[model samples]
Target: SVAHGLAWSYYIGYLRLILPELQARIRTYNQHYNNLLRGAVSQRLYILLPLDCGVPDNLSMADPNIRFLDKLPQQTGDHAGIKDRVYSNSIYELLENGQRAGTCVLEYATPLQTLFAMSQYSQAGFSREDRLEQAKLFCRTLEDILADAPESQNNCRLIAYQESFSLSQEVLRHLRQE
Candidate 1:
């Protein structure tokens, strides 16, 4: 559809570069279109399953699935099957727990999505040249946002630090085609 094409290009193209004008336009159009469509997510759950529990809702302390708090208990033994489906208007920041033993299963994903986690302050030793370039970009975009917007107080801080990864996935894909 023409509308879908416009939205996709505006979002994935201009939004990725933080183009303010295009992003504002796309956001306005999306909100208007979404209100007409009546599309929504129901049955949101925020569960912290005990380590001993094999399934998610089964070990929930609450009677039903939807009414539980943002935090919950973990079972004692090696447990894996618990899950959580939570939404926040702002981002969720985790507290320091050196020996935490629980998991929050993302609500609707099929367990196969690749989520990109970017590091803070450090570029994981990106070549000095690339590091400088990214820092310049960040200063222009995110840092600028924080400097100006007092209302913009929240951001998701990921703790599962893996090794420094490359953002060359798109380049690799292009190489494969060549």
Candidate 2:
């Protein structure tokens, strides 16, 4: 499912592939429509995931297969299976106002995702020093992705650092102890 989204990006530009594309769109439609009624905007976006366990019951209380945390685990691995059912396409909708509104979706691979060895699976998972590592992962992914977005309407960058190798060892030392 997710492959379609990745493939879509090849056609689109460096479209962000955040999993929360659903909420992002509703937020826009809502805030924008509120504008149509009057005039409509950003406070900020803060998120957390890789919880220590399964998704909360309340979070998905309203739907089938909805209880998981924002970005928990999937046995098929988030890489592809999750994508299978995901939005899998950046939204380019002609808004009620007539202009086209496109989505810059996003998805994440975090330090928490890393420390927990989350790539192969998901199950509610995370820590502080652990947090530092996650912060690093978070920053690198963004900066890395950002560099890709330069002049192109779309961007794709895959860069690795030798320093990150030792960096991983360092992270493992502290995390493994705790």
Candidate 3:
């Protein structure tokens, strides 16, 4: 079957070494993504973003009923070298060391649809203050998402991975959790 299988096997080996849980999370993310798309859950949403991708920063909650909730990577960078560096804005972003590397935002609309939006910031920046600003907004958005979501999804957790930024247990978002 040509050399494709060998080539894939080679990369898969290194990938597992660098990120052991990543592949598992991708499966969980897609599982939930299908739920959102097919209306299986009817309340939950998933985010699929390329690492280091950039998006608009002016985003915010359009509904008053929306509320933000907890976040991953932690606000203090205590979990897996992640910290909320932006918290004051309507939309939140992320920073590593002193540079911005990621961002996740939440959106809610009519008919009970919750949207999850995130970016790696991928740019050269997102200071601690800016990071905290967006974090605040992200929490607010998650609160809204959770409120609008079905209670059955309460057990699912957002796991970060390099390729998939998701709210499910898989998709590790390529970050180390210590």
Candidate 4:
């Protein structure tokens, strides 16, 4: 059922624009439908892009765009625009881009419980060097957060949660694919 939605999203892709909606539906389904049928079901929102896609050179953790991915934002510059800039008007932007480049955004809502069955993928996988690099970037961000003022320290829970999430994602990547 989840894979069917992913296939549909890939075939009729507008993942970024529809992801929030899908997340809401997932929450609703989990709370109402899934719980009534099963116990407490779990879900997650995943974004997928082509394997070879690359972005700017100076991306940093400070950038608001890639924060959830545990990466930095684009560095501020003289003339360079915001790196990984996600607009408030994503659906409109997708329409404006002639739907070509925008056609690749694919979102998947998965039952989190089923993800544990990915051990076969884990055995067949290759290590993710790029993901490890990204993890280093996150570790640096964590170090900086720890060095911040006391008020910032109060928000350490957020950083810890991010770190845990990032680590789990890396584990999944190592298990799933390169």
Candidate 5:
């Protein structure tokens, strides 16, 4: 399931925009967590570019206008833009230019969990160089984050959820896909 989403995203060019941010966030978050805990769990980063299917603007469904991915102007900006538009609204943006790049907040899992989650994709494998490159990028980001003020660590925790009696079907649908 994870592989499927990633393959779809890559096919549509969304992974090109999302991978760097996801990898960077993985590094930054791990660095901060290790600083606070004196040791952090090791994990790998993966990109999930969810498609908005069954709609006119659904790029996965052959939407001609790529701009539809950025339906709202708010989707392009800083990390906050990701929280405001991506997390809150369940929408992701694919900017035509690199003027504004947003990062996504990560959800942590134990090494065992991560392995099991990925083990399901045993039929596929990433190149040795690709794996090493990901680790190097994550380590570099950790070093950079460690130099910043501690409070800046909270910048990654930008997503928020509100309590409600009504369950969000979209979230359930995405989960079911996973």
Candidate 6:
């Protein structure tokens, strides 16, 4: 529990500290890229369905029960005979067809969770100490930039991107070693 607390605080605190400058850079990139910097922040889907209801291992238009919801559910009460689970797809698919496919709500991870997850790469050979320190340095640089401007803050969505990117890297590494 203590270790969890430390990691949580460290990553989240740094994120808040660096957000301002990160936002500024994102704005500059968006301008220079001709507004092509859209969808930088990523989100995942959170699906809820009744237990015993078979969910597809891979989602597609083939399954009949996988039908799209005409409207997103809005009730907090756990109705009887209902089960809930979370699932996700690409941001592009989520935007393009998620709404069309009646499934579940979409969700985003906070900056804290995003960075904490990223830090886990260290445990898998990215080197924890080095990664942590690098994150700290990045935050420091971000702080210096924001301090000089003090009013150049911009809004950037802070969602943890999916873990597939790093997981794929790990898979490739394992294959190479074999």
Candidate 5 regions with alpha-carbon error over 4 angstroms: 1-13, 33-35, 38-43, 46-84, 87-178
**Alpha-carbon lDDT of model 5:** 0.30
**Which number leads on TM-score?**
2
Top-down lDDT ranking: 6, 2, 5, 3, 4, 1
Predicted structure 6: lDDT: 0.32
Clash pairs, model 6 backbone: 50-83, 68-101, 68-102, 69-102
lDDT of 3 by residue, 1-178 (tens): 1123322332233222222333333344336433353311111222322122222222222212222322322122122354533211121233344443332333211101111121224352444444334433444443444345443133223321233323222221422231
Model 5 collision count: 0
Q: Output the number of the lDDT-best candidate.
A: 6
Clashes of each: 6, 21, 32, 4, 0, 4
lDDT of 4 by residue, 80-165 (tens): 35464442111100122222111111121121112223322566242344333333343344335335523222211211222213
RMSD of each predicted structure: 19.9, 15.4, 18.9, 19.1, 17.6, 19.9
Candidate 4 segments exceeding 4 Å error: 1-13, 35-43, 48-178
Off by over 4 Å in 1: 1-98, 101-131, 154-178
Q: Where's the lowest-lDDT run of ten residues in candidate 3?
A: 107-116
* C-alpha local distance difference test of each model: 0.25, 0.31, 0.29, 0.28, 0.30, 0.32
Per-candidate TM equals 0.19, 0.27, 0.20, 0.22, 0.23, 0.24
Task: Write down the TM-score for model 5.
Answer: 0.23
- Give stretches of model 6 more than 4 Å off: 7-9, 35-94, 98-178
Clashing residue pairs in candidate 4 are: 60-72, 60-73, 61-72, 63-73
Report the C-alpha lDDT of model 1 over 1-178, residue by residue, as the tens digit.
Answer: 2223332343343222332232233344335532354322111122221111112322222212222223212212222453532212211111123221221212211110101112222544333444334333432343344345442222111111112332122212222332
TM-score of 6: 0.24
lDDT of 1: 0.25
